[PDB]
Amino acid sequence: NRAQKLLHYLGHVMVNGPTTPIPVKASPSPTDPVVPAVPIGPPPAGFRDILLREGPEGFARAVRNHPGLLLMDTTFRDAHQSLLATRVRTHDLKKIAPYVAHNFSKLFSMENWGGATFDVAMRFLYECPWRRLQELRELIPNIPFQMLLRGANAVGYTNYPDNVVFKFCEVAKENGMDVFRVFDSLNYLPNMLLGMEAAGSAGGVVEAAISYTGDVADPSRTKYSLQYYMGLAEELVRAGTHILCIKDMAGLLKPTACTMLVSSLRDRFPDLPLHIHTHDTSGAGVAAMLACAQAGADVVDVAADSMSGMTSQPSMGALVACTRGTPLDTEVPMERVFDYSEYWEGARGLYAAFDCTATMKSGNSDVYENEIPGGQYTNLHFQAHSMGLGSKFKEVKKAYVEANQMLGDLIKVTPSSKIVGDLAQFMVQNGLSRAEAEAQAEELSFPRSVVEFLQGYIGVPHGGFPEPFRSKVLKDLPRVEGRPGASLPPLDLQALEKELVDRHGEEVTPEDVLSAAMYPDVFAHFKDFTATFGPLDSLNTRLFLQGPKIAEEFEVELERGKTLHIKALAVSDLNRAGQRQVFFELNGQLRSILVKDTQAMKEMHFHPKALKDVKGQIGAPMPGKVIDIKVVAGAKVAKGQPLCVLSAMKMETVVTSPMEGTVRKVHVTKDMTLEGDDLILEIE
């Protein structure tokens, strides 16, 4: 019995408009993407059976001894985050999940879990990550899944207590999550050791990712030399990981740097599998990927053709065709590739409301001097749009270079990238250059994020903080060193459950408790809106965004037990009250409800009205202009004396003092239109 709340949502969409902020105006494609047919038989068993049967190390050995190359479709997380603002719901994903299970059993592993998946499922979109994860894992019983995880902060942006992160990892593994990736913003050794230890405590296949920046083929700059990365890999390997992984956030891999680094690591690690992640922002990613594959790569990240290019991962087809005659022999059907690409482009056509292709058309070479992370460009563009700064977005990216170089050649990863982007925003809205910021570091009101980083909440940069700027900014601000996760006191996991179940909700589960501990207020708002509108996510994307149209019929699956349909009838009209009626016809009955519009009165005039109950109160006898008032406020007047004169074209009503006393205040000064019984002055 939530159809009432759902229709209230629909009517609120009809009147007040779509609720989620929209960066650019657009209209959804009326057409519906076509899903290809799927075989009746259960999906063929992929590599998940090995994990279910063999240990994580046994699985790693089986992959390593396998001849050929292993593939990852990263469309579900990295493309959505990068190309879009990853505002995709799970309905369309489920529409294709059986096809993927039935056809893509040769894939290495699947990425479905994001870092900002919680933020999008809470703040703007309204979904529970655990739920649709559960349905997807049901639909995919035979491909292992990979989730994104950071070093100290599990999904947050500040370092976090060890115990809560361990419990969260335990919960995720208990749910059925398969493969874990753990990394750090600056590759901070205590944080990465903590993450590796947490993943080992969870139990499963564990990898660590090395943040690659710059070019290792340039001997002029050895800020992070091949020796540096090699030693880093040395402590990672001695840490006992399953597989090493490499992530190219900005797609800055030359095939030369590819081959020399891959050889440099494979020579001393002959049985170590390889995982490669890159963003095809510059359009030359495919060459580097092919060079790595020739050089001894094992697993790589690559996106569907329709969702490829631009800033996402490269395409299926390029690598598939390039290795047909090549002994690499990716050995995957092209028909499934075409079906996947066509379905994905059809689905993208629906999310045309905020495609960044209007802003940026094709990937440029402006990454080698800008180093914008591939995954956050559209999101930061939309952040600027919310800030209204989209007009100068061309200068916004111009500021990023110096925003980073304020703090030096840092490892610009998602937290650091966000901080640098915030710094660029601040100095571009203030419009001051490098010298103005550096000389006035104390003077400028930097956000709490600047002092947060300079304090050392995330960690310590390998190169170290900028001492003069940090001294100018922090000054009296405390500086906590060491591992902040070790520095941060542990926090309770129990009394918060009681507090939340007292405030709302009358059931106990650890999932919502840990979610609210990670993020209380957005959790509360999400619960508020869901309660006011019942279950969601059972609708179509077009229905979710723009709502039903006039005299069109559409079936709505309320839940699995029953499915009904609603017929939108008419918009009715604005009432004198802010409520508006809207007409709706469900399966066999007609109904209409009241919708509040955001146009409640315009509040003009409301001139003071003299009250006749108080005989001392004076009201204007006739409406018109005032030629003059013979009395100033706080002046004594006598009974029957002229004190004010009203004006019209034929009569001149001279005001008479109602009694003896002094005038408090003259509401009318001179020459304003008056009404009958208007407050002029009060006499006592």
Ligand X SMILES: *C(=O)CCCC[C@@H]1SC[C@@H]2NC(=O)N[C@@H]21
Chain positions contacting ligand X, by CB under 6 A: 115-116, 119-120, 375-376, 379, 414, 417-418, 650
**Integer CA distances (angstroms), 662 to 103, 463, 635, 645, in order:** 94, 78, 5, 18
How far apart are the C-alpha atoms of 160 and 194, rounded to whole Å?
Answer: 11
Q: Give me Rg for the CA atoms of the chain.
A: 33
| Residue 429 binds a second copy (CB under 8 A) | yes
The interface region with a second copy, picked from 43-51, 201-209, 422-430, 555-563 by CB under 8 A, is 422-430
Per CB under 8 A, the list member of 267, 271, 573, 603 interacting with a second copy is: 573
How far, in Å, are 290, 353, 404, 436, 547 from residue 442 at the CA level?
Answer: 49, 42, 18, 11, 50
Give, as ranges, the residues between 509 and 568 that touch a second copy (CB under 8 A): 550-551
77 is an annotated ligand-binding site residue: yes
CB of 329 or CB of 442, closer to a second copy: 442
CB of 208 to ligand X, least distance (A): 18
The count of chain residues that interact with a second copy, using the rule CB under 8 A, is 42
Q: How far is the CB of 383 from a second copy (least distance, A)?
A: 7
Closest CA to 88 of 26, 3, 20, 185: 20
Q: Which of 227, 386, 405, 662 binds a second copy (CB under 8 A)?
A: 386
In three-state secondary structure terms, 207 is strand
Interaction between residue 632 and a second copy (CB under 8 A): no
Helices (H), 388-432: 393-406, 414-430
198 annotated ligand-binding residue: no
Q: Choose among a second copy, ligand X, none what residue 115 binds, the Cβ cut-off being 5 to 8 Å by kind.
A: ligand X
Stretch that binds a second copy, among 53-61, 133-141, 488-496, 620-628 (CB under 8 A): 620-628
- Beta carbon nearer to ligand X, 343 or 400: 400
The entry of ligand X, a second copy, none near residue 590 (CB within 5 to 8 angstroms by kind) is a second copy
The residue range among 6-14, 56-64, 253-261, 447-455 that interacts with a second copy, by the rule CB under 8 A, is 447-455
Nearer of residues 486 and 570 to a second copy, judged by Cβ:
570
Contact of 31 with 349, CB cutoff 8 Å = yes
Return the DSSP state at 122: I
Q: Cβ-count burial of 165 within 10 angstroms (0-12 exposed, 13-18 middle, 19+ buried)?
A: buried
Residue 600 touching a second copy (CB under 8 A)? no
8 A C-beta contact, residue 89 and residue 544: yes
Is 385 annotated to bind ligand?
no
Residue 572 touches a second copy, criterion: CB under 8 A: yes
Is the separation of the CB atoms in 279 and 312 below 8 Å? yes
d(CA 285, CA 290): 9
Q: How far apart are CA 205 and CA 145, in angstroms?
A: 10
- Which CB, 201 or 430, lies closer to a second copy? 430
Smallest distance from the beta carbon of 643 to a second copy, in angstroms?
A: 9
What count of residues does the chain have? 684
Among 577, 590, 600, 635, binds a second copy (CB under 8 A): 590
Decide: is 651 part of the binding site for a second copy (CB under 8 A): yes
438 in contact with a second copy (CB under 8 A): no
Task: Closer to a second copy by CB, 361 or 650: give it.
Answer: 650
Residues with Cβ within 8 Å of residue 34, at least 6 apart in sequence: 342, 343, 346
Smallest CA-to-CA distance from 61 within 51, 71, 72 is with: 51
CA-wise closest residue to 317 among 92, 309, 93, 349: 309
- Whether 377 contacts 282, CB under 8 Å: no
**Is residue 81 marked as binding?**
yes
> How far, in Å, are 7, 15, 553, 565, 594 from residue 590 at the CA level?
12, 19, 13, 12, 14
- Check the annotation: does 440 bind a ligand: no
Contact between 569 and a second copy (CB under 8 A)?
yes
| Cβ pair 598, 16 in contact under 8 A | yes
Annotated binding residue 80: yes
C-alpha distances (whole Å) from 608 to each of 136, 618, 667 are 64, 11, 9
Shortest distance, CB of residue 651 to a second copy, whole angstroms? 6
User: Least distance to a second copy from the beta carbon of 639, Å?
Assistant: 10
Is 247 labelled as part of a ligand binding site? yes
Q: Is 605 annotated as a binding residue?
A: no
Report the nearest approach of a second copy to the CB of residue 89 (Å). 22
**Tokens 């299926």 sit on residue:** 316
Of residues 19 and 449, the one with the C-beta less far from a second copy: 449
Q: Which is nearer to ligand X, 11 or 375 (CB)?
A: 375
* Cβ proximity to a second copy, 578 vs 621, nearer residue: 621
The tokens 């619960």 sit on which residue? Answer: 527
- Amino acid (one-letter) located at 552: E
How many of the other CB atoms lie within 10 Å of CB of 28?
Answer: 16
Does 279 carry a binding-site annotation? Answer: yes
Note whether 579 binds a second copy by CB under 8 A. Answer: no
Strand partners, 150: 183
Q: Give, in degrees to the nearest 5, the angle at Cα 427 between 424 and 433.
A: 110
Q: Which residue, 417 or 617, is less far from ligand X as judged by CB?
A: 417
- Residue 652: contacted member of ligand X, a second copy, none (CB under 5 to 8 Å, by partner type): a second copy
Options 640, 660, 664, 671; binder of a second copy; rule CB under 8 A: 640
- 156 burial (CB, 10 Å; 0-12 / 13-18 / 19+) is middle
Looking at the Cβ atoms of 254 and 625, the one nearer to a second copy is 625
Give rounded-to-5 percent helix, strand, coil for the chain.
40, 15, 45
- Residues in contact with a second copy by the rule CB under 8 A: 383, 386-388, 422, 426, 429-430, 442-443, 445, 447-449, 475-476, 550-551, 569-573, 575, 581, 583, 590, 592, 621-623, 640, 648-649, 651-656, 658, 676
Point out the annotated binding site. 77-81, 150, 247, 277, 279, 414
Point out the annotated binding site for substrate. 77-81, 150, 414
Point out the annotated binding site for Mn(2+). 78, 247, 277, 279
